[PDB]
Write a protein that binds this DNA or RNA. Structure first.
Ligand SMILES: Nc1nc2c(ncn2[C@H]2C[C@H](O)[C@@H](COP(=O)(O)NP(=O)(O)OP(=O)(O)O)O2)c(=O)[nH]1
Ligand SMILES: [Mg+2]
Ligand SMILES: [Mg+2]
Ligand SMILES: [Mn+2]
Ligand SMILES: [Mn+2]
Length: 539
DNA sequence: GACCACGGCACC
DNA sequence: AAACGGTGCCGTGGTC
């Protein structure tokens, strides 16, 4: 384009270069804009931010987050990435979008601004006529990007000193386990090397090899195969404990406290909006959507996430979300009655697993039951279900058969979805979000059936993500007016931060908004708790 | 230093 | 590991 003097006119498309992918940590190297056949390159990008009223262009949210970091209210506007992601959720990166819709993603702000303009015009034209996708764009994704920008810039408080001390305790427990392993193996070696561990367990020792690795065909040392040998040898027990502790230490305990931002004093993730095939968000740098919780040690890690002084965390989580969605999508009256009668299928399944009754189930049992219910639903095999549960193969067959028989209309909806998927090439959510699944007609059974599992899972998981996103859109302005903050989303859950004097009203308000986000043939129920830390707020 | 593949595993 | 789905990060082992 023709070079034009900064500032650009309103509504121009922006381009920007960051020193690193994380907006909260990045140095803004260059800033440019393009409109009306002109290009505008900023002489000093930081000062030039003040001239923009809106971040409109590729990766708009990132720039908006960096602006909020600098105290500037620069909301994100149109982003061609959001248009492409709605056209096809395999559009996940600017490189691929440009290579697909006519452009080149470079490292120069001016070119990124010019690309943003062309790509918007092209993708906008491609969506001309996709009424449902346009609705998702205007009413969910585009306003959501603003919500996520505020969440990313706000961050979450972390009890660093607590995690530092925990790192030292866990270290001593790791050393003891390592010593028991070396002594049992008769020599030292790198316990973190699965290749070296393979030799010890299966060659040196005579333990049988349950399974192989996918790509290289090596004897697997995964927990699933080692769990089979939890009695066939004692060193296996200690190795599983060693991995558990090193996993949590190396992934969470040690890195997280080193990511506190100097200006905010809090921990800042990134909520990626075009990263999944089903419409879910993802979290990275660091991923705060997979903080441990299953084990007592993992719960100790959760307690590190705390509220600012004078505030309280509010945790809200949808109940049996994808099962309620399946009720609406399929119409199985039996399944609708379950929820219109207040029954809990996770608890009910936990009863048959552990042979204990209703009131006896604790969270640990119910978690196990939750994996079973969704495992069976989305196509787990009797052989694997026999592996888990530790019941005979026939006993796993009967459970899967009774599971689907309890809700007869579910299996019928699956086939309608696949038929439509085969005919149409894609499956869609309740709101029309699409995922393309061409392999539904592949000639290799394994490939075809794998694609089938992906196909009929997407409308359920995708609808749940749609509902959550829409709830965040509706809830955010209500939180601001009450002086509350939205901190985290974990697919079917939100963590808010509210002043102590308002935490109660915020919790009630957020519960109502999430439950009424979009009435279905089944009621949506939300569980809510308040506490000083993430764990106590969710229990 | 920068990338990357792989096995492995944490979250919903 | 295996006919659950969706993610991202770890250390290892390797290349340039
Ligand atoms: N396929 C699959 N989906 C899963 C799994 N775990 C979770 N999901 C999906 C399906 C779940 O509906 C959704 C939310 O997960 P939660 O909040 O941890 N559990 P829920 O909402 O079911 O029940 P409650 O909140 O009353 O304990 O994530 C899994 O192992 N597999
Ligand atoms: Mg991988
Ligand atoms: Mg899986
Ligand atoms: Mn839930
Ligand atoms: Mn949840």
């Amino acid at each position: 384009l023709e070079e034009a003097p900064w500032p650009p006119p309103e509504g121009a498309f922006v381009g920007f270069v960051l020193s690193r992918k994380e907006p909260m940590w990045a140095d803004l190297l260059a800033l440019a804009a393009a409109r009306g056949g002109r290009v505008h390159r900023a002489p000093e990008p930081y000062k030039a931010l003040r001239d923009l009223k809106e971040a409109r262009g590729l990766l708009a949210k990132d720039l908006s987050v960096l602006a909020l970091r600098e105290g500037l209210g620069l909301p994100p506007g149109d982003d061609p990435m959001l248009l492409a992601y709605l056209l096809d959720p395999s559009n996940t990166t600017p490189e691929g979008v440009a290579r697909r819709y006519g452009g080149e993603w470079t490292e120069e702000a001016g070119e990124r601004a010019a690309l943003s303009e062309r790509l918007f015009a092209n993708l906008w034209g491609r969506l001309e006529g996709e009424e449902r996708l346009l609705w998702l764009y205007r009413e969910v994704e585009r306003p959501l990007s603003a919500v996520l920008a505020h969440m990313e810039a706000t961050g979450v408080r972390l009890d660093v000193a607590y995690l530092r001390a925990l790192s030292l305790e866990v270290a001593e427990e790791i050393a003891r386990l390592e010593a028991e392993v070396f002594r049992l193996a008769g020599h030292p070696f790198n316990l973190n090397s699965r290749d070296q561990l393979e030799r010890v367990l299966f060659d040196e020792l005579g333990l049988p090899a349950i399974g192989k690795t996918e790509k290289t065909g090596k004897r697997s040392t995964s927990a699933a195969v080692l769990e089979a040998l939890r009695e066939a040898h004692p060193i296996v027990e200690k190795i599983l404990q060693y991995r558990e502790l090193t996993k949590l230490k190396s992934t969470y305990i040690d890195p997280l406290p080193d990511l506190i931002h100097p200006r905010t004093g809090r921990l800042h993730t990134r909520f990626n909006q075009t990263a999944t095939a089903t419409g879910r968000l993802s979290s990275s740098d660091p991923n705060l959507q997979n903080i441990p919780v299953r084990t007592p040690l993992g719960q100790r890690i959760r307690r590190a996430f705390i509220a600012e002084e004078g505030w309280l965390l509010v945790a809200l989580d949808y109940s049996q979300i994808e099962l309620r969605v399946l009720a609406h999508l399929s119409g199985d009256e039996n399944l609708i009655r379950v929820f219109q009668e207040g029954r809990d299928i996770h608890t009910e399944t936990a009863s048959w697993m552990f042979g204990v009754p209703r009131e006896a189930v604790d969270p640990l049992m119910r978690r196990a039951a939750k994996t079973i219910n969704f495992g069976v639903l989305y196509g787990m095999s009797a052989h694997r279900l026999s592996q888990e549960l530790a019941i005979p193969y026939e006993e796993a067959q009967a459970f899967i058969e009774r599971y689907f028989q309890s809700f007869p209309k579910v299996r019928a909806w699956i086939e309608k979805t696949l038929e439509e998927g085969r005919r149409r090439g894609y499956v869609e959510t309740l709101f029309g979000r699409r995922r393309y699944v061409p392999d539904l007609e592949a000639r290799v059974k394994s490939v075809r059936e794998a694609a089938e599992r992906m196909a009929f899972n997407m409308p359920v998981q995708g609808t749940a993500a749609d509902l959550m996103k829409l709830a965040m859109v509706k809830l955010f302005p209500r939180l601001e007016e009450m002086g509350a903050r939205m901190l985290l989303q974990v697919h079917d859950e939100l963590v808010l931060e509210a002043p102590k004097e308002r935490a109660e009203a915020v919790a009630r308000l957020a519960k109502e908004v999430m439950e009424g986000v979009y009435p279905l043939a089944v009621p949506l129920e939300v569980e809510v708790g308040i506490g000083e830390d993430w764990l106590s707020a969710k229990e």
